[model samples]
Target: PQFEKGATTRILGVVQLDQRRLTDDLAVLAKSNFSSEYSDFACGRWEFCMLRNQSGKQEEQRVVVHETPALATPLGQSLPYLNELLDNHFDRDSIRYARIIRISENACIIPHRDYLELEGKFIRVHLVLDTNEKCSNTEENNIFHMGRGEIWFLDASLPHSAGCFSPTPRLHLVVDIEGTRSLEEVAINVEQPSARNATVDTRKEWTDETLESVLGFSEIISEANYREIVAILAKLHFFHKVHCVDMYGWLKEICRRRGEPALIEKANSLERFYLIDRAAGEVMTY
Candidate 1:
């Protein structure tokens, strides 16, 4: 069921552990703890952060990045290398939302899609601190070139892109696994980098020549981070892979043909509370 009803991406692989004690040294613990500040949240040139959470029932305090169930409230008791890499490889109660995903150095992140219950109820993971081959994660289904203490299990609900054009700075630690297991004992999958050339355009036309040729955005769609980078590229226009448009009615027709009725009313309230509200899926946008 994970991509059989109108496919978008797939490369089911598993097994590639080089556990030298889970190879520590995540870029010197993400430079003594996060914040290098890159931008464009639509999935590219990322530099996102969030490590303080506690939700509802009188304990309200949140800055959730995506990924549910999280708490301990502040920098989660000072991440001792993500608290010893989640007690040595995951399942500290199937942890959820531990961020810090910097993607600097030639920036690029266009294609997107984060939920369709991504690989079933957010079970994504990746911990490569600093990557190479100019930071890969290209498209055409897959092309992730990870390094630095590699770790992965990403099937980011399909339509993808994360390009980094090399120089330095691609650090990652994106974890969000939840109540799950039986990815056949989680076989790690990653290996498809021989200079990839990927492309797929089923024009649901998010324009400016497809938002500056599939969103490279040299900036100009009326700032405010280009309407928060076109509301994270209209949540990569749903339904996994290509050929699906009307992304906020094509970003309210590119903010009403650049007249920007307030970035077309903040891309119609972030495309109706994060792209066509799914009963408020318990909000979290970053």
Candidate 2:
């Protein structure tokens, strides 16, 4: 219940800096190989980051490891700045990922929600580097911008995006760490793995364990219980009355085996109750 919605809040004050060197060096690095293979958007804008993003084995894509041989490139050397600055707020050892993202001027990233994959399991932090007033982050419809050299917790699970109207490039040093309860529910405290070590959006799919855990199914038997179960499952799109024994179908099979014809009848009624329109292959409501 706590993290179901998105949150955007400032986490740190103006960080100490040799502002001049950061500006000069990053301006040079932005043009270097750190940003070579660009992924372009339809708006004449594109991005390339300093880290590697690998596809997941059983899940969607996520950041798995750091670029090997850290000191081989100038960008890698400058990467220490992220570690150093973040150390003030998090246990440096708990830090899972740190990467540099460059936003082209006058570019608007399409609004999208994350956390559909393994990447959504971690708490995300964004440290602004090269941004002007025109460079901003938008959550829902409310918009705001973090001053360069400050950090904020970005709820990537929420619908959000960034658009820059400034002529100068905007850069963000982004980091992902183990998710834990924050100091005030809006700050960092370094804490899933591929399977997720925490709660997730149940709307994504129906894993039998998580579904039954949420639905509170009993394997034994009961007639009255079936009515209650089907009533609730009817409202959730994850359950379907398909031939392959989906959530609802599996329950029906169990009822049949247990010889609880009362429950079995109610289970089949799910189709008549407008819960499962079999021909549609999914929810009829949707």
Candidate 3:
């Protein structure tokens, strides 16, 4: 008999739990008397009641939470339920860490990626407690409905932002799960995985011939000239291959370091540069 390989599935939507049960859990959590905690970014009102990470200095620890399970107390035993919920989607043995995050109204989480240094073992589960109906997208047909006990597996690596829309506060039981899976297991497989690998041999490909040609043509050009050149290159869609903004910034910094005011002035005068516009009245321009 051929052994069947277990197929893994990524689950989204509400968890299999009744609203009453969810409400009861929320009541227990509220009664636990969790307090607000400050996060990395400033946005909205928040309270973090520490159950686990009681010292709250678990900066290096794999898990930190507003709550934790205590063997001596029955009220603190909801961790098993949370664990079971996670086990339904992920391999239980693979789980290395978890956390519970609580968010409030008028709260906005800025767009950001999770810890990239962790090498992608991190996954976040958001359990929405309450949300508004009028929070639908004005231009789009997306409706806001966060029924109690809903669970969403969000790939935190992707940029995401959230804010409470209701007059009442919205609560989310956020669970950050880290797995023991290798980078290969989590990485999206593509045919050209290492097509642009920066090996020593690849670096050696930048010979004097290539460097000389690049340096020879590296003189600072006027903003008008740069724009004309870029426009023509853009017509051929070369802008897609080469990021002009990054290239210009690199050249500008080099000019600044060399104290070549003329070169810096030329680069800084680029018509369509965002930074130049931001520093318009504050910065000196040639």
Clash totals in order: 3, 0, 9
TM-score of each: 0.28, 0.51, 0.43
lDDT of 2 by residue, 112-198 (tens): 344442323567777777788767665543456666666677776665566666788778877665566352432333220022232
Which candidate, 1 or 3, would have the higher lDDT against the true structure? 1
**Tens-place lDDT digits, model 1, residues 145-262:** 6556556566655545565656777776666666255543332334433343443333253345645443334336665566455545534543224323234455566667676566
Find the 10 residues in a row with the least total lDDT in model 1: 1-10
Q: After superposition, how far is residue 111 of candidate 1 from its true place, in Å?
A: 4.4
Could you arrange the candidates by TM-score from highest to lowest? 2, 3, 1
lDDT of 3 at 40: 30
* Better model by TM-score: candidate 1 vs candidate 3: 3
Q: Could you give candidate 3's per-residue lDDT for residues 1-286 as a string of tens digits?
A: 0112222212244445556656666666655554333343214444443323333333322333222321112333554454344445444334334344454654543323344334333455555555554221110111123345545555444433444545666566554444434423321211222222221111123245633433333454454454433223212111122222333434455456556566667656542222223221222223
Model 1 ranges off by over 4 Å? 1-17, 21-23, 27-37, 41-45, 48-160, 163-229, 232-234, 237-239, 243-249, 252-254, 257-286
RMSD of every prediction: 17.1, 16.7, 16.7
> In model 3, what lDDT does residue 185 have?
38
**Per-model C-alpha lDDT, please?**
0.50, 0.49, 0.39
For model 3, which pairs clash?
34-49, 35-48, 35-49, 36-47, 36-48, 37-48, 51-66, 51-67, 52-67
Flag the better candidate by lDDT, 2 or 3. 2
